[PDB]
Write a protein that binds this ligand. Structure first.
Ligand SMILES: Cc1cc2c(cc1C)N(C[C@H](O)[C@H](O)[C@H](O)COP(=O)(O)OP(=O)(O)OC[C@H]1O[C@@H](n3cnc4c(N)ncnc43)[C@H](O)[C@@H]1O)c1[nH]c(=O)[nH]c(=O)c1N2
Ligand SMILES: Cc1cc2c(cc1C)N(C[C@H](O)[C@H](O)[C@H](O)COP(=O)(O)OP(=O)(O)OC[C@H]1O[C@@H](n3cnc4c(N)ncnc43)[C@H](O)[C@@H]1O)c1[nH]c(=O)[nH]c(=O)c1N2
Lengths: 390, 390
């Protein structure tokens, strides 16, 4: 072939299309029974396929400017234009998040059809054994035979959800060719609480609060879910990429309001209501009960509360420090932080600086998006950028 | 005198200080028994004395660029520097809002002391009868006698809270000298609901929700209060300056979350809970009961709810259109929108373009700040700018 791509996911199929459209004869190999398994299950089966605000600040990397070039060369609109062209209903939800109306599968079907038109060859349920450099490019050995190619594209994703065929193949190939690998971790993952915290929040399983999840300078406002394993909801998932074991996150419940103010207002205006009943006018019932207990104010009358006491109560709700036991790991993470070091890669090409004809695209790379369509957009953009050069 | 100022409020005393410090002999006249009565009662008696983000976008005007010059010449830091210099404890709350730690009166005492040092003369409980142009400047007639001055500064505020000595004096003087007056209205004011709306929200008096209050392109996220008169809380107050009679505002309750998502999640995860009980895991109890009733789902089991039904329920909570009966008017507004037309005023001076030696500062002018310290900062800046020229 002129081009062999490992992994028929978001980045791989995009690259395929662009290289097939250039008349380049391309072959895509994947160990799965079906292409784009993550696409398929993503955005709750709807696929949050991009985000209108996609830009360098929405990604974590060791070199923050690395993604600048690809992102500008392939924008959310460009992908939207592609979807509309295939009659795929889409809409925005919150925070710039674009979803399909019908199902993630429309997108798979689409990429598929685009590949068929571009002349690319797809081989599924095919495992990779080795890759060797050759005087002429590369040879890859597979459970189905061997292929030679001038260009080889590593588009095999990251470590999240092993059950779906996630592997670290990309990292093994990077190291094999001497490319550094930025240390990887489960990201956009729920966070665990220890048996004691879980006992204390015993009765709050199922509550869902509007909240800021803060770690130092990073803050996200979205739902926080309390479960029997601990903390999830989009705000946890976001901050989970910034947090590290041993550390505290700070939760601001009902972040747009000032609870101390409210409570003093209710104090004059009514006065003779129980504390937990005043809180229940502000928070879901179970949370109200919880915060009134912890503070030892249950059944106490709102008018008997000093200012100092109210401030402390508010503070317990709006500056709530939690120290997570850990993360739930790769069986539950949406994304892998870290990956093939960017410094070793051509920003406008995706090609290994040290190894002509070798390319790394998509999530396997040390560019990691916030939750909200940013990861798919990076997959798109970098697949596209490689597809122009490959 | 060299300079007579009408109104010993925020803008007037600031101007006084700056003109007194220049050796200009100044006199401040006020019909009140005490200076800075609004300062005194402002920020809940604490005084929200500025906002660190103060800038042109935080103000409504007929000429949006008018305030640019003054704001840059006198910044929140400049005022902070002044407070610290007088040993006045201050802190930030939310949204850039600076407050005193002790009381608004510290600030009054301070401005006072600064005036005494600057040599300015203060006359209180003194009413204004007329102002005439003179070959030499101005003559003002007062319940205490007459004064002549080369410069006359109108710093008499707006129409809000008549009980505290608010009057439209500024507007009467503008018109008398042919300066146009941008149409005035109660702003940062609660909004009223009609008897029918008030009956429907009968049982929600006292609830306080995190919410977005939206009118077209304007949106503010803060607390929304439901009372027996209707709607208040900072988010109402903010949007009230943008809204107009006959129109709708849209309320997004729990704006950082997607309730449709949450509810579908709770549907799989639990399933056999009553709708209103699922909502109570998200909203204060009374709101949960309200939204479940309106939608006619009370006691219904969360797993018997179609997607379409959930979407509609969510939408009722997060795209909630309300048509207000009116505003509560000037007895309750924090600020007056509109005022002396800016186009008629020197942006870098506050002087009437058509009338040498006549100046208009502070709230009487057609520059109106969002809630959060922006109005005091405009008072400061414009008082200061005038005080340099006067
Ligand atoms: C549940 C869930 C939900 C979402 C998301 C993830 C998850 C887990 N994501 C993240 C998103 O799925 C992710 O960023 C992309 O799929 C990455 O694109 P890639 O092409 O790089 O890898 P990708 O996952 O797409 O594909 C990698 C491919 O290589 C194959 N492969 C792996 N190892 C192999 C091997 N050893 N040999 C051969 N082939 C191998 C795989 O089977 C697979 O098809 C997301 N992102 C987003 O922007 N919006 C969203 O809504 C979501 N939602
Ligand atoms: C309850 C409340 C709370 C707040 C606020 C307002 C209110 C009502 N504000 C708004 C703020 O008070 C306002 O913007 C300023 O006081 C305006 O500054 P001025 O100097 O222009 O008028 P200002 O109100 O200060 O003073 C005008 C003066 O002229 C005098 N006067 C009026 N008519 C007269 C007449 N006919 N003859 C002689 N004298 C007359 C008055 O007695 C008064 O002292 C606020 N803003 C903010 O930035 N942060 C905040 O926290 C608050 N909080």
């Amino acid at each position: 072939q002129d081009v062999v791509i490992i992994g028929a996911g978001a980045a791989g199929m995009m690259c395929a299309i662009e290289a097939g459209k250039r008349g380049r004869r391309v072959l895509v190999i994947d160990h799965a029974r079906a292409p784009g398994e993550k696409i398929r299950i993503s955005g709750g089966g709807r696929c949050n396929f991009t985000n209108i605000h996609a830009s360098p600040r929405n990604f974590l990397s060791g070199n923050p400017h690395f993604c600048k070039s690809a992102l500008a060369r392939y924008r959310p609109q460009d992908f939207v234009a592609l979807v509309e062209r295939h009659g795929i209903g889409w809409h925005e939800k919150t925070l710039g998040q674009l979803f399909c109306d019908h199902s993630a599968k429309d997108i798979i079907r689409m990429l598929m059809a685009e590949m068929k038109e571009a002349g690319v060859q797809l081989r599924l349920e095919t495992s990779i054994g080795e890759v060797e450099r050759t005087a002429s490019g590369f040879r890859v050995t597979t459970s189905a035979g061997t292929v030679d190619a001038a260009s080889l594209v590593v588009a095999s994703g990251g470590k999240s959800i092993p059950k779906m065929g996630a592997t670290g193949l990309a990292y093994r190939i990077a190291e094999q060719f001497g490319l550094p690998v930025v240390e990887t971790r489960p990201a956009l993952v729920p966070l665990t609480l220890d048996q004691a915290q879980l006992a204390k929040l015993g009765a709050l399983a199922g509550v869902a609060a509007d909240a800021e999840a803060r770690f130092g300078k990073a803050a996200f406002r979205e739902a926080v879910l309390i479960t029997h394993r601990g903390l999830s909801g989009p705000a946890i998932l976001q901050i989970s990429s910034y947090w590290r074991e041993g550390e505290e996150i700070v939760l601001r419940l009902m972040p747009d309001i000032d609870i101390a103010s409210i409570l003093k207002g209710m104090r004059r205006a009514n006065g003779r209501q129980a504390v937990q009943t005043a809180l229940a006018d502000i928070l879901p019932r179970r949370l109200a009960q919880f915060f009134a207990d912890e503070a030892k104010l249950t059944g106490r009358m709102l008018a008997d509360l000093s200012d100092k006491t109210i401030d402390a109560l508010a503070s317990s709700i709006q500056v709530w420090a939690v120290k997570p036991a850990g993360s739930e790991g790769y069986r539950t993470a949406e994304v892998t932080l870290g990956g093939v070091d960017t410094r070793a890669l051509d920003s406008r090409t995706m090609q290994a600086k040290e190894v002509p004809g070798l390319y790394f695209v998509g999530e396997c790379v040390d560019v990691t998006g916030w939750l909200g369509g940013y990861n798919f957009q990076w997959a798109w953009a970098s697949g596209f950028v490689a597809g122009q050069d490959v």
